[PDB]
Design a protein around this nucleic acid. Structure first.
Ligand SMILES: [Mn+2]
Ligand SMILES: [Mn+2]
Ligand SMILES: [Mn+2]
Ligand SMILES: [Mn+2]
Ligand SMILES: [Mn+2]
Ligand SMILES: [Mn+2]
Ligand SMILES: [Mn+2]
Ligand code: NA
Length: 325
DNA sequence: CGGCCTACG
DNA sequence: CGTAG
DNA sequence: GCCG
Protein backbone atom coordinates (compact mmCIF):
# COMPACT_ATOMS: atom_id res chain seq x y z
CA UNK A 1 0.00 0.00 0.00
CA UNK A 2 1.66 3.24 -1.14
CA UNK A 3 1.90 6.17 1.23
CA UNK A 4 0.34 8.89 -0.97
CA UNK A 5 -3.36 8.77 -1.84
CA UNK A 6 -2.62 9.68 -5.48
CA UNK A 7 -0.64 6.43 -5.85
CA UNK A 8 -3.60 4.10 -5.31
CA UNK A 9 -7.16 3.78 -6.60
CA UNK A 10 -9.84 4.85 -4.15
CA UNK A 11 -13.41 3.99 -5.21
CA UNK A 12 -16.48 5.86 -4.04
CA UNK A 13 -17.90 2.86 -2.19
CA UNK A 14 -15.67 0.45 -0.33
CA UNK A 15 -15.39 -2.19 2.41
CA UNK A 16 -14.51 -0.20 5.56
CA UNK A 17 -17.17 2.48 5.63
CA UNK A 18 -17.74 2.49 9.38
CA UNK A 19 -14.06 2.64 10.25
CA UNK A 20 -13.32 5.45 7.79
CA UNK A 21 -16.29 7.48 9.05
CA UNK A 22 -15.06 7.31 12.65
CA UNK A 23 -11.57 8.46 11.70
CA UNK A 24 -13.06 11.30 9.66
CA UNK A 25 -14.97 12.50 12.72
CA UNK A 26 -11.64 12.83 14.54
CA UNK A 27 -10.15 14.58 11.50
CA UNK A 28 -13.02 17.07 11.46
CA UNK A 29 -12.68 17.72 15.19
CA UNK A 30 -8.93 18.30 14.82
CA UNK A 31 -9.70 20.93 12.19
CA UNK A 32 -12.10 22.69 14.55
CA UNK A 33 -9.19 22.98 17.01
CA UNK A 34 -6.79 24.33 14.38
CA UNK A 35 -4.62 21.19 14.19
CA UNK A 36 -4.21 20.71 10.44
CA UNK A 37 -1.50 18.08 10.95
CA UNK A 38 -3.72 15.80 13.01
CA UNK A 39 -6.57 16.45 10.58
CA UNK A 40 -4.35 15.28 7.74
CA UNK A 41 -3.19 12.09 9.47
CA UNK A 42 -6.75 11.05 10.37
CA UNK A 43 -7.94 11.88 6.83
CA UNK A 44 -5.06 9.90 5.31
CA UNK A 45 -5.65 6.93 7.62
CA UNK A 46 -9.34 6.94 6.69
CA UNK A 47 -8.43 7.07 3.00
CA UNK A 48 -6.09 4.07 3.34
CA UNK A 49 -9.05 2.04 4.58
CA UNK A 50 -11.14 3.17 1.61
CA UNK A 51 -8.44 1.77 -0.72
CA UNK A 52 -8.30 -1.69 0.86
CA UNK A 53 -9.80 -4.59 -1.12
CA UNK A 54 -11.79 -6.11 1.77
CA UNK A 55 -12.94 -5.36 5.33
CA UNK A 56 -10.49 -5.02 8.19
CA UNK A 57 -11.51 -7.73 10.69
CA UNK A 58 -8.54 -7.86 13.09
CA UNK A 59 -5.97 -5.39 14.37
CA UNK A 60 -3.21 -7.46 12.75
CA UNK A 61 -4.40 -6.25 9.34
CA UNK A 62 -3.26 -2.69 10.12
CA UNK A 63 0.40 -3.75 10.41
CA UNK A 64 2.44 -2.01 7.75
CA UNK A 65 -0.42 0.21 6.58
CA UNK A 66 0.77 3.81 6.09
CA UNK A 67 -0.58 6.46 8.49
CA UNK A 68 -1.69 3.97 11.17
CA UNK A 69 0.09 4.54 14.45
CA UNK A 70 -0.94 4.13 18.06
CA UNK A 71 -3.86 6.56 17.97
CA UNK A 72 -5.58 5.53 14.73
CA UNK A 73 -4.97 1.84 15.51
CA UNK A 74 -6.62 2.17 18.93
CA UNK A 75 -9.68 3.76 17.31
CA UNK A 76 -10.01 0.82 14.91
CA UNK A 77 -9.32 -1.74 17.67
CA UNK A 78 -12.13 -0.32 19.79
CA UNK A 79 -14.54 -0.31 16.84
CA UNK A 80 -13.62 -3.93 16.07
CA UNK A 81 -14.01 -5.03 19.69
CA UNK A 82 -16.96 -2.97 20.93
CA UNK A 83 -18.59 -1.50 17.82
CA UNK A 84 -17.94 2.04 19.08
CA UNK A 85 -14.92 4.18 19.98
CA UNK A 86 -15.39 6.12 23.20
CA UNK A 87 -13.30 9.06 21.95
CA UNK A 88 -15.34 9.31 18.76
CA UNK A 89 -18.63 9.21 20.66
CA UNK A 90 -17.37 11.83 23.11
CA UNK A 91 -16.56 14.14 20.18
CA UNK A 92 -19.91 13.45 18.50
CA UNK A 93 -21.97 14.54 21.51
CA UNK A 94 -19.73 17.44 22.56
CA UNK A 95 -21.28 20.90 22.42
CA UNK A 96 -18.06 22.26 20.89
CA UNK A 97 -18.08 19.78 18.00
CA UNK A 98 -21.80 20.10 17.27
CA UNK A 99 -21.73 23.91 17.31
CA UNK A 100 -18.49 24.18 15.33
CA UNK A 101 -20.01 21.86 12.72
CA UNK A 102 -23.26 23.84 12.48
CA UNK A 103 -21.47 27.19 12.18
CA UNK A 104 -18.77 26.12 9.71
CA UNK A 105 -21.42 24.58 7.44
CA UNK A 106 -22.72 28.10 6.87
CA UNK A 107 -21.56 29.55 3.56
CA UNK A 108 -19.40 32.50 4.59
CA UNK A 109 -18.30 31.10 7.97
CA UNK A 110 -14.97 29.35 8.47
CA UNK A 111 -13.29 27.76 11.45
CA UNK A 112 -11.93 31.10 12.69
CA UNK A 113 -15.31 32.86 12.64
CA UNK A 114 -17.15 29.88 14.11
CA UNK A 115 -14.61 29.60 16.93
CA UNK A 116 -14.96 33.28 17.86
CA UNK A 117 -18.76 33.01 17.86
CA UNK A 118 -18.49 29.91 20.06
CA UNK A 119 -16.25 31.77 22.50
CA UNK A 120 -18.83 34.59 22.55
CA UNK A 121 -21.48 32.12 23.74
CA UNK A 122 -23.43 31.71 20.50
CA UNK A 123 -24.80 28.23 19.82
CA UNK A 124 -27.68 28.21 17.28
CA UNK A 125 -28.58 29.70 13.91
CA UNK A 126 -31.29 31.83 15.55
CA UNK A 127 -28.58 33.21 17.84
CA UNK A 128 -26.83 34.51 14.72
CA UNK A 129 -30.10 35.74 13.18
CA UNK A 130 -30.89 37.90 16.22
CA UNK A 131 -27.95 40.28 15.59
CA UNK A 132 -27.60 40.36 11.79
CA UNK A 133 -25.72 43.68 11.79
CA UNK A 134 -22.37 41.95 12.38
CA UNK A 135 -22.81 39.43 9.53
CA UNK A 136 -21.30 39.78 6.10
CA UNK A 137 -23.47 39.79 3.00
CA UNK A 138 -22.05 36.34 2.23
CA UNK A 139 -22.97 35.11 5.72
CA UNK A 140 -26.45 36.64 5.51
CA UNK A 141 -26.98 34.71 2.27
CA UNK A 142 -25.62 31.50 3.75
CA UNK A 143 -27.86 31.90 6.80
CA UNK A 144 -31.04 32.72 4.85
CA UNK A 145 -30.51 29.75 2.52
CA UNK A 146 -29.03 27.37 5.10
CA UNK A 147 -31.99 24.96 5.17
CA UNK A 148 -32.07 24.53 1.38
CA UNK A 149 -28.28 24.29 1.27
CA UNK A 150 -28.44 21.42 3.78
CA UNK A 151 -30.61 19.29 1.47
CA UNK A 152 -28.64 17.02 -0.85
CA UNK A 153 -28.31 17.96 -4.50
CA UNK A 154 -29.43 15.07 -6.70
CA UNK A 155 -28.34 13.98 -10.17
CA UNK A 156 -31.64 15.24 -11.61
CA UNK A 157 -30.79 18.67 -10.20
CA UNK A 158 -27.35 18.59 -11.84
CA UNK A 159 -28.67 17.86 -15.34
CA UNK A 160 -31.15 20.73 -15.03
CA UNK A 161 -28.49 23.18 -13.84
CA UNK A 162 -26.04 22.24 -16.59
CA UNK A 163 -28.54 23.07 -19.34
CA UNK A 164 -29.27 26.54 -17.97
CA UNK A 165 -25.55 27.22 -17.47
CA UNK A 166 -24.86 26.10 -21.05
CA UNK A 167 -27.54 28.41 -22.45
CA UNK A 168 -26.03 31.43 -20.69
CA UNK A 169 -22.50 30.38 -21.67
CA UNK A 170 -23.58 30.00 -25.30
CA UNK A 171 -24.90 33.56 -25.43
CA UNK A 172 -21.92 34.93 -23.52
CA UNK A 173 -19.42 33.26 -25.87
CA UNK A 174 -20.42 31.00 -28.77
CA UNK A 175 -18.27 27.89 -28.81
CA UNK A 176 -17.55 27.88 -25.07
CA UNK A 177 -18.01 24.56 -23.30
CA UNK A 178 -19.26 23.51 -19.86
CA UNK A 179 -17.81 20.49 -18.03
CA UNK A 180 -19.26 18.99 -14.86
CA UNK A 181 -16.56 18.59 -12.20
CA UNK A 182 -16.32 18.03 -8.46
CA UNK A 183 -17.88 15.04 -6.74
CA UNK A 184 -20.45 14.36 -9.45
CA UNK A 185 -17.64 13.78 -11.97
CA UNK A 186 -16.21 11.19 -9.50
CA UNK A 187 -19.54 9.33 -9.68
CA UNK A 188 -21.33 10.63 -6.59
CA UNK A 189 -25.11 10.39 -6.76
CA UNK A 190 -25.66 13.31 -4.35
CA UNK A 191 -23.68 16.33 -3.26
CA UNK A 192 -23.71 19.62 -1.40
CA UNK A 193 -23.16 21.76 -4.52
CA UNK A 194 -22.49 21.52 -8.24
CA UNK A 195 -19.12 22.43 -9.77
CA UNK A 196 -18.68 23.45 -13.42
CA UNK A 197 -15.58 24.28 -15.49
CA UNK A 198 -15.89 26.53 -18.55
CA UNK A 199 -13.41 27.02 -21.38
CA UNK A 200 -13.19 27.83 -25.08
CA UNK A 201 -11.13 25.98 -27.73
CA UNK A 202 -9.42 29.20 -28.92
CA UNK A 203 -6.81 30.35 -26.40
CA UNK A 204 -7.64 33.80 -25.06
CA UNK A 205 -11.29 33.87 -26.10
CA UNK A 206 -12.28 32.94 -22.53
CA UNK A 207 -10.95 36.25 -21.18
CA UNK A 208 -13.77 38.26 -19.58
CA UNK A 209 -16.23 35.40 -19.88
CA UNK A 210 -17.46 34.89 -16.31
CA UNK A 211 -18.96 38.40 -15.84
CA UNK A 212 -20.89 37.91 -19.10
CA UNK A 213 -22.17 34.52 -17.95
CA UNK A 214 -23.22 35.86 -14.55
CA UNK A 215 -25.08 38.85 -16.03
CA UNK A 216 -27.14 36.56 -18.26
CA UNK A 217 -27.96 34.15 -15.44
CA UNK A 218 -28.87 37.11 -13.21
CA UNK A 219 -31.21 38.60 -15.82
CA UNK A 220 -32.89 35.19 -16.16
CA UNK A 221 -33.72 35.48 -12.44
CA UNK A 222 -31.68 32.38 -11.56
CA UNK A 223 -29.11 33.94 -9.20
CA UNK A 224 -30.06 34.29 -5.54
CA UNK A 225 -26.52 35.33 -4.55
CA UNK A 226 -23.06 35.92 -5.97
CA UNK A 227 -20.01 38.15 -5.40
CA UNK A 228 -12.80 37.11 -12.08
CA UNK A 229 -12.40 33.37 -12.83
CA UNK A 230 -14.25 31.69 -9.92
CA UNK A 231 -17.85 32.48 -9.01
CA UNK A 232 -19.41 30.99 -5.85
CA UNK A 233 -23.14 31.34 -6.46
CA UNK A 234 -26.48 30.33 -5.01
CA UNK A 235 -28.83 29.32 -7.82
CA UNK A 236 -32.60 29.23 -7.83
CA UNK A 237 -33.49 25.74 -9.08
CA UNK A 238 -37.13 24.99 -10.01
CA UNK A 239 -38.90 22.23 -8.09
CA UNK A 240 -42.40 20.74 -8.41
CA UNK A 241 -44.55 23.82 -7.94
CA UNK A 242 -41.72 25.74 -6.29
CA UNK A 243 -37.90 25.89 -6.18
CA UNK A 244 -34.87 25.47 -3.93
CA UNK A 245 -31.58 27.26 -3.41
CA UNK A 246 -28.52 25.35 -4.65
CA UNK A 247 -24.84 26.21 -4.37
CA UNK A 248 -23.10 26.27 -7.78
CA UNK A 249 -19.44 27.01 -8.52
CA UNK A 250 -18.53 28.32 -11.96
CA UNK A 251 -14.85 28.43 -12.93
CA UNK A 252 -13.19 29.57 -16.16
CA UNK A 253 -9.82 28.44 -17.50
CA UNK A 254 -8.02 28.93 -20.81
CA UNK A 255 -7.77 25.77 -22.86
CA UNK A 256 -4.00 25.63 -22.20
CA UNK A 257 -4.77 25.30 -18.48
CA UNK A 258 -7.95 23.23 -18.83
CA UNK A 259 -6.36 19.82 -17.97
CA UNK A 260 -4.87 21.23 -14.78
CA UNK A 261 -8.11 22.93 -13.80
CA UNK A 262 -10.14 19.81 -14.64
CA UNK A 263 -7.77 17.73 -12.49
CA UNK A 264 -7.88 20.16 -9.58
CA UNK A 265 -11.65 20.75 -9.63
CA UNK A 266 -12.45 17.03 -9.92
CA UNK A 267 -10.80 16.28 -6.56
CA UNK A 268 -11.24 14.81 -4.16
CA UNK A 269 -9.85 17.53 -1.92
CA UNK A 270 -7.58 15.02 -0.18
CA UNK A 271 -6.55 13.51 -3.51
CA UNK A 272 -5.43 16.89 -4.81
CA UNK A 273 -3.57 17.87 -1.59
CA UNK A 274 -1.77 14.54 -1.78
CA UNK A 275 -1.05 14.90 -5.51
CA UNK A 276 0.44 18.36 -4.99
CA UNK A 277 2.42 17.08 -1.99
CA UNK A 278 3.70 14.15 -4.06
CA UNK A 279 4.63 16.40 -6.99
CA UNK A 280 6.74 18.73 -4.87
CA UNK A 281 8.30 16.32 -2.38
CA UNK A 282 8.90 13.29 -4.60
CA UNK A 283 9.32 14.84 -8.08
CA UNK A 284 10.47 18.40 -7.35
CA UNK A 285 7.62 19.89 -9.42
CA UNK A 286 5.08 22.51 -8.31
CA UNK A 287 1.46 21.71 -9.18
CA UNK A 288 -1.67 23.85 -9.03
CA UNK A 289 -4.88 24.24 -11.03
CA UNK A 290 -3.08 26.47 -13.56
CA UNK A 291 -0.10 24.26 -14.42
CA UNK A 292 2.91 22.21 -13.38
CA UNK A 293 6.21 24.06 -12.94
CA UNK A 294 9.77 22.75 -13.02
CA UNK A 295 11.67 25.17 -10.73
CA UNK A 296 15.05 23.83 -11.89
CA UNK A 297 14.54 24.47 -15.61
CA UNK A 298 12.02 27.28 -14.94
CA UNK A 299 9.50 25.83 -17.40
CA UNK A 300 5.82 24.91 -17.39
CA UNK A 301 4.71 21.51 -18.59
CA UNK A 302 2.27 21.56 -21.49
CA UNK A 303 -0.64 19.19 -20.97
CA UNK A 304 -3.40 18.27 -23.35
CA UNK A 305 -5.14 15.84 -20.99
CA UNK A 306 -5.30 14.59 -17.43
CA UNK A 307 -3.48 11.52 -18.73
CA UNK A 308 -0.58 13.81 -19.70
CA UNK A 309 -0.34 15.15 -16.15
CA UNK A 310 -0.26 11.71 -14.50
CA UNK A 311 2.45 10.70 -16.99
CA UNK A 312 4.52 13.82 -16.22
CA UNK A 313 4.42 12.95 -12.50
CA UNK A 314 5.28 9.27 -13.03
CA UNK A 315 1.91 8.07 -11.69
CA UNK A 316 -0.40 5.40 -13.06
CA UNK A 317 -3.51 7.06 -14.45
CA UNK A 318 -6.58 7.08 -12.21
CA UNK A 319 -10.00 7.92 -13.69
CA UNK A 320 -12.17 10.31 -11.64
CA UNK A 321 -14.14 7.48 -10.06
CA UNK A 322 -10.88 6.21 -8.49
CA UNK A 323 -9.89 9.60 -7.02
CA UNK A 324 -12.29 9.36 -4.07
CA UNK A 325 -9.56 9.60 -1.45
C1' DC B 1 12.93 17.45 13.86
C1' DG B 2 9.75 20.02 10.14
C1' DG B 3 6.12 19.36 7.18
C1' DC B 4 1.57 19.03 6.42
C1' DC B 5 -1.56 22.07 -1.17
C1' DT B 6 -2.06 26.02 -3.28
C1' DA B 7 -4.64 28.73 -5.30
C1' DC B 8 -8.73 32.88 -6.03
C1' DG B 9 -12.71 36.38 -4.08
C1' DC C 1 -11.25 36.90 6.58
C1' DG C 2 -13.96 33.95 3.13
C1' DT C 3 -14.08 30.39 -0.96
C1' DA C 4 -12.52 25.80 -4.02
C1' DG C 5 -11.13 20.88 -5.18
C1' DG D 1 -0.75 12.19 14.23
C1' DC D 2 2.16 10.36 11.55
C1' DC D 3 6.20 10.07 8.24
C1' DG D 4 10.51 10.06 6.45
MN1 LIG E 1 -2.94 10.15 20.87
MN1 LIG F 1 -11.81 -3.14 24.88
MN1 LIG G 1 -18.54 20.14 -4.98
MN1 LIG H 1 -18.05 23.64 -5.10
MN1 LIG I 1 -5.92 32.39 -13.18
MN1 LIG J 1 7.58 18.60 15.54
MN1 LIG K 1 -16.09 21.70 -0.14
NA1 NA L 1 -18.53 27.66 5.92
Amino acid sequence: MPAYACQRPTPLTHHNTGLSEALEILAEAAGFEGSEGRLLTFCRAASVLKALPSPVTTLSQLQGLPHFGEHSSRVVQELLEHGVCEEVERVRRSERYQTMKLFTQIFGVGVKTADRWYREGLRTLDDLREQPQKLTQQQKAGLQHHQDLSTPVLRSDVDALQQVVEEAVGQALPGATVTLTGGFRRGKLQGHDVDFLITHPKEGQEAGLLPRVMCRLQDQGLILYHQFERSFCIFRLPQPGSWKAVRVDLVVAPVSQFPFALLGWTGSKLFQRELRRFSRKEKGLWLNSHGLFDPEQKTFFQAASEEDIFRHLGLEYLPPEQRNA
